[PDB]
Design a protein around this ligand. Structure first.
Ligand SMILES: CO[C@@H](C)[C@@H](NC(=O)[C@H](CS)NC(=O)CCC[C@H](N)C(=O)O)C(=O)O
Ligand SMILES: [Fe+3]
Length: 329
C-alpha cells in the first residue's frame, strides 16, 4: 500500500581516517543518497547505540512528574524564562503523547561569553538531581561529544560530496560554540491512545508529527526499531525502514540554502504508532555567527543568487516557525 523508500546503508568509517580515496567513495554515496530520497543510514559509525538506548530508557522511565516541572522549558513553566530550548517538554495525558528532554552544548556554561551576552538560542543546560539519576548527566554529556564526533565525520563526507575541501562545514562546527542539540524523545504506548494526540494527513495517514523540513544543517538520528518515518518523493510518501543499529541522516533547510537545493531538505513526517519507543535526534547546528557563502554545484561558475544567512538567524527563526507550523512539542 505504501512503498519502501530507498535508504541506503553507507559505511562511514572511512570518514574517521586518512584514506582520501576511500573518503571520496563515501562522499559519492552521500551525494547519491542526498540527490535521491535525501535519507541514508550511517553504519560503522562507532557509537554504542544500545547503551544510549538503555541509559535513555532508564531516565525516561524513572523521571517523576515533580522533576519534569522542575526541569520544564518555558512553554510549560512560566518561571523558567531562560529555558526556551533546554529542559523538559511535558506530555499532556489525553491530548499530547510525546515528551522529551533537550540539551545543548555542555560548554555553554555560566561563564561562556555567549551566555554572558544572553545571545538567543544559547542556554545553560538543566539536569535532574544526580542522586535520583546517577550517571545520567555524565552519560548524556559524553553522548553529545560522541555524536558530535560522528557528525564532524559526516560533515567531512558532505563537504567532499559537494566538491569542497573536507573542512568546508566542519570548520564552523566547533566544540566551543556549536548550537547543536540532543533531544531524548519518548513516544509512549498508550491504551487507549487519545485521538486528540493523533493527527491525520491529507492522505488519511495517522501521524504524530506533520510534514516539515528540518531546522538543521544535517540531522543525525537514532530511533528504536519501530517503523515510523515517511519521506515525500515524486512517487508520494514512502516508508523509511527502521534500523536501530544505524543512524538515520538527512539534510536540513540550511544545507538546502547553501547548496541552492542541490541537496534538498527532504519533506518528511512521523506516523502515529502505538508503541513505546525512542527517537533521539542530534541536530547539527553551526555557530551563532557562522555564515557559509551559498553556492550551486550544478552551475558552471558555482554561483548562487541566494544571500548569505548566519546560522544563528536561521536557527532562531526556524525553531519558532516550526513550532508555529507543527505545534509545541
Ligand atoms: C524523526 O523525527 C525526529 C527527529 C523527531 N522530531 C523532532 O525532533 C522535530 C522535527 S525534526 N524537531 C523539532 O521539533 C525541533 C526541536 C529542536 C530542539 N528543541 C532545539 O532547541 O534544538 C521525532 O518527532 O521523532
Ligand atoms: Fe524532522
Amino acid at each position: 500500500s505504501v512503498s519502501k523508500a530507498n535508504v541506503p546503508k553507507i559505511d562511514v568509517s572511512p570518514l574517521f581516517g586518512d584514506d582520501q580515496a576511500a573518503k571520496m567513495r563515501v562522499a559519492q554515496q552521500i551525494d547519491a543518497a542526498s540527490r535521491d530520497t535525501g535519507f541514508f543510514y550511517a553504519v560503522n559509525h562507532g557509537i554504542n547505540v544500545q547503551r544510549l538506548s538503555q541509559k535513555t530508557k532508564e531516565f525516561h522511565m524513572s523521571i517523576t512528574p515533580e522533576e519534569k516541572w522542575d526541569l520544564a522549558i518555558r512553554a510549560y513553566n512560566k518561571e523558567h524564562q531562560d529555558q526556551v530550548r533546554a529542559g523538559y517538554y511535558l506530555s499532556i495525558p489525553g491530548k499530547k503523547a510525546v515528551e522529551s528532554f533537550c540539551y545543548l552544548n555542555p560548554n555553554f556554561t555560566p561563564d561562556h561569553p555567549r551566555i554572558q551576552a544572553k545571545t538567543p538560542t544559547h542556554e545553560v543546560n538543566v539536569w535532574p538531581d544526580e542522586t535520583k539519576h546517577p550517571g545520567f548527566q555524565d552519560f548524556a554529556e559524553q553522548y553529545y561529544w560522541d555524536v558530535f564526533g560522528l557528525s564532524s565525520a559526516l560533515l567531512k563526507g558532505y563537504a567532499l560530496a559537494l566538491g569542497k575541501e573536507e573542512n568546508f562545514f566542519a570548520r564552523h562546527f566547533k566544540p566551543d560554540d556549536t548550537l547543536a542539540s540532543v533531544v531524548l524523545i519518548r513516544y509512549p504506548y498508550l491504551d487507549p491512545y487519545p485521538e486528540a494526540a493523533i493527527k491525520t494527513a491529507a492522505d488519511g495517514t495517522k501521524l504524530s508529527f506533520e510534514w516539515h523540513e528540518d531546522v538543521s544543517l544535517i540531522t543525525v538520528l537514532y530511533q528504536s526499531n519501530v517503523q515510523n518515518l515517511q519521506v515525500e518523493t515524486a512517487a508520494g510518501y514512502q516508508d523509511i525502514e527502521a534500523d536501530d543499529t544505524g543512524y538515520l541522516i538527512n539534510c536540513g533547510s540550511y544545507m538546502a540554502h547553501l547548496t541552492n537545493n542541490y541537496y534538498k531538505a527532504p519533506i518528511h513526517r512521523v506516523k502515529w504508532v502505538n508503541a513505546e519507543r525512542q527517537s533521539l535526534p542530534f541536530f547539527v547546528n553551526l555557530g551563532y555567527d557562522s555564515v557559509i557563502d551559498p553556492f550551486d554545484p550544478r552551475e558552471p561558475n558555482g554561483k548562487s543568487d541566494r544571500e548569505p544567512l548566519s546560522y544563528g538567524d536561521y536557527l532562531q527563526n526556524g525553531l519558532v516557525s516550526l513550532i508555529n507550523k507543527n505545534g509545541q512539542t
